[model samples]
Target: GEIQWMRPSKEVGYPIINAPSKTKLEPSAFHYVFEGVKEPAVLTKNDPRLKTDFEEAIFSKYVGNKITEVDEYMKEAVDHYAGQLMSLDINTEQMCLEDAMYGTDGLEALDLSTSAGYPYVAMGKKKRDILNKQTRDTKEMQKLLDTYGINLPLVTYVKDELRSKTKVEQGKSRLIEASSLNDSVAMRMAFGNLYAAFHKNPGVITGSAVGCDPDLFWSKIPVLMEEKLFAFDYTGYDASLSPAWFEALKMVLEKIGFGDRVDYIDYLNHSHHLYKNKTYCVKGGMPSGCPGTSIFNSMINNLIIRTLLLKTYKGIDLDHLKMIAYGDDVIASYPHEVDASLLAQSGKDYGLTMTPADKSATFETVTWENVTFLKRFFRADEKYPFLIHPVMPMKEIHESIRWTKDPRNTQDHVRSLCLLAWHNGEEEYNKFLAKIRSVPIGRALDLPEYSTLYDRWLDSF
Candidate 1:
């Protein structure tokens, strides 16, 4: 059957991942892959999927249809998942911290170690000049730079290093550069940018920290906190409109002063941490694995779905989807379509309004249009997938060679393995190996032993 496309639905828009539903729902088994092993209270019932029997057994001793024979195996799976999640989350948090520190104005204050050296001095001058021009108050900028803790001597050293280098050499230099005149400024900028960028481009920074701040990272927590408070108050669990959780939250409210209340449980429930809730813990025996893989997999699935929906309805054919070197930018392309029906329907469904950037161009005209189709596919509803922002194109590279599907190279095989590992577990890894073996060998050549292959290949060069 031919695939049918539809217009962008009005229901779709920004804030694609909605607040968790207030009503209690069963947790998915998948959510409990990791619960008590790594981090306590990470999952909760607000998750879309409920807990599984396997998870229940490990976290809780609630034996039903299954016997106690595989209890040990279940425990191992829980531990594995928990360890993986902890590692992934910690790595993400570290990266997020680094990005926050380096990508902002805060970095500008630090003296370039290479300053007073060749090439760096020149770059410093350029950076300084830009700062001088941009700021109306030079004294404020200087003060800001002082706060970074580096002294003038270091800046002078970096400047000297930059001045002696040739233009080409400077481009190749690995020395860090500042985005502004303030040293701590870079860190501040990085903090905000990293957070915003993570939420914007989850596809590239999957399972990594882009914006996991403690106070703001769990923005949805307040909503859940509020819901629980409301229920507690009405039910007379505590008559003074104050529950234990609410009283704890009041400390935060006192500091910040009067903001909207949200349920923290709701945020946890709808998030990757679904089964790590208080209720589940009381029941006991849930899995303890990281949902980092699941989170990445879910993001990838959402991206594919968005692309497919856009192609079907908007006539836009996404040719390539990939992450940029920094891992913050998403680069993709919409190849020109050959099918007339696909192209025509695409414009209507997406409500594409293209205006000529150059009205007088002879062959074609440059145009800009809002592709809101992304919003529709990633709506902030129960049915909608997670939100992901599209980034602008940067540099383009040309590939010198292409291999046919039959003759898979080592690089191709490695790439396939990386992608497979992104979505599956150890069991799936074995299955992938079997599938690879099923493919017939193409042109065979003498190859180095597997153990020393990497070193041998490098030596051959």
Candidate 2:
């Protein structure tokens, strides 16, 4: 392992064809070596393009694996390689306090949301300059430019934060903080960025889950939201990923040239948990930097299911449908109990199960392991049913806890409530505002002589 992972240094910059680092910190778009694997690099510019076709030779062996059984290696990998999975924490820590959670506002100065699209170059001057010199805008170019996940100002903020970190080298700290750090490795960045880009625009190429993008999983959400068809969404999901699952996918990608971007991710490496100085590869789950792209894994799993269902995945009318998936996370929307059970039974061979062995599934009723969603998340007005994210009581109660949790600092309380209100919607904030106002931001919830009088305050409707 030690020899295979040797990292050549900055004589000509790292992570190019020659200086591949075992870990993502090297920041190469594609990695051509395994750690400790010393194959000589081509000395000339005319290096033949990389190629492989193993995914085809053994793809179907994986297709028949029991879905009810946990992909044990993936489970082991998640714990063993947990260090690589910290992007969720990093994203929240660095930005969510100021509103940069998955679906929140990126600051305006960087213009990340509306500008800064795919082929993320602007952060690096050479690439950014070259891109700037290209045709100002084509249709796809305009689409890519119109939407991105980060901004220049945020990078500036991160650079300042990097400067603040006490024990890092000066020269490396001078590098783009976002690109160099394990948290912001461009490998994960590209995984997430490409996923998000394709998610936003499903037609950019023929996509997955039988070649459908994640948008197919949620594209119905807008209609569902507008028409009020949601509420219970362990049915709506992103699934737990596994290594056998993806190893098989690499084979599937071989049906074509296997030019798949994920294939290049083998260069991925992350901090060793027990030994901080060491690095290890993931056996399963999106490597720490690339969790958001689980949609790809889920869709691939469903492709197996799709083959078994005679492609009845998104069935003729939803009634006849057994399942539709986004990646590892799958869903079966039906009113009949037997249909679910039958699907559950049939799901074993097809790699689509109602309950995963890892306790990751969801259930409409109080089934043992999965989250029991008893409340009707979608209910009716006189005209049509309405949809919502969580059961309203649960939503309001959580917000109230957050509202009054740490009352020592009223200013932090104010900012938090404002952020909460801004994000969750002001309708819920009235209780947060009115209750706290009367109580004046205290440690406890101030109940009225009659708690019923607080209905206007507590009711989330």
Candidate 3:
């Protein structure tokens, strides 16, 4: 049978993922073999069947069964979140759609290069100049943030590391850079904290979508990572949001009284790219380099995960289930007898390809690779659950130390040492400090009065 694509409505200009199906979808080895534990190998690319398989696999996964129509559940999820944003006074209106075109989040997006092949640093400088030239009154910008408290909701919700106002301020100049990512990140933090504050068990934990904290995420691994609890990763996370979902997002904004700023939503809708000196339009998911991609992707993904947690299936008490998601990466200690494969299947229902299709033990075991999230890995003790330890391979740590010794690597240097000291503790930190001193190429790690280098590292980044 030929695959048929569905349009959310006749008004929709483009198609979304293939319509929901009862076809009993199978797991793709492409996802597991390419990204899972298997070793990489070169493969022939000329097969036409390979192209057809690629299209089928990729298309089927995007919306999976997430949406059949823009129905009640979809509207309710959008409305519910929009109301939360409004109630918290998050400045959704201040989103500048235009900035996404030239905005660089400094996270190394490939779209930084120009048609003439200019280096990203040069392109970044040009972008900064353009942004600076615009009539931006620092006072007015501060006034807006203070009034709306763009970072206020998250900071006020918790006294944790996400509370830094300066970090929020730096990206204000690059709204496209910070807007969706920070907004989505801050909201996730706030929502997670809010849930924890109210829940009876109250054992929830979360991390920034901008990045993850392995030490923080793994603290509960002993209690959370169980034999039956499977960890799954989303394929092409940034490119997974359906085009129809963007319209749903617009509806969310408009419903929440952000109708005046609806144009701001256009940033993600009409993103563009260049190839062979010709302009190309992006008609599917959020483009990789768009500054808005992170937040937009995070929000849509959050909605999908929200459904998993809030709704019940096959007698499963999903409401009691706790999931820790850093952007699209997710793990949870599901109940022993629950059908975990259905959880992965749920993602497909909405348009994501979660790995290890069904919960068969072969591809489902939680290994170091599966748990290596946000740059840190956790190696749990086979016998003792409480003995879970964080792992940053010796080679990687040694390389990080060597990189930190270079004086030019100021920002990255500070970041490396902060994590090293935090994860490895004082003895290892001092060991690395001495190694830095022994090297002649650069200065020693500058000691700060404060015991933790986390704040200083955040500043450097």
Q: Which candidate is the best by TM-score?
A: 3
Best by lDDT: 3
RMSD of each: 28.0, 17.8, 14.2
Quick one: how many clashes does candidate 1 have?
Answer: 84
The local distance difference test score of model 3 is: 0.40
Score candidate 1 by TM-score against the native.
Answer: 0.19
Reference-based lDDT, each prediction: 0.24, 0.29, 0.40
Compose the digit string of candidate 2's lDDT tens values, residues 243-262. Answer: 44555444433332223454
TM-score per candidate: 0.19, 0.37, 0.50
Q: How close is candidate 3 to the true structure, as a TM-score?
A: 0.50
**lDDT by residue for model 3 over 230-343, one digit each (tens)?**
566666555566555677767765765656555544554444322212222344455443332444455565456555433435344433444544556555555553444566
The list of candidate 1 runs beyond 4 A from truth reads 1-178, 181-184, 188-461
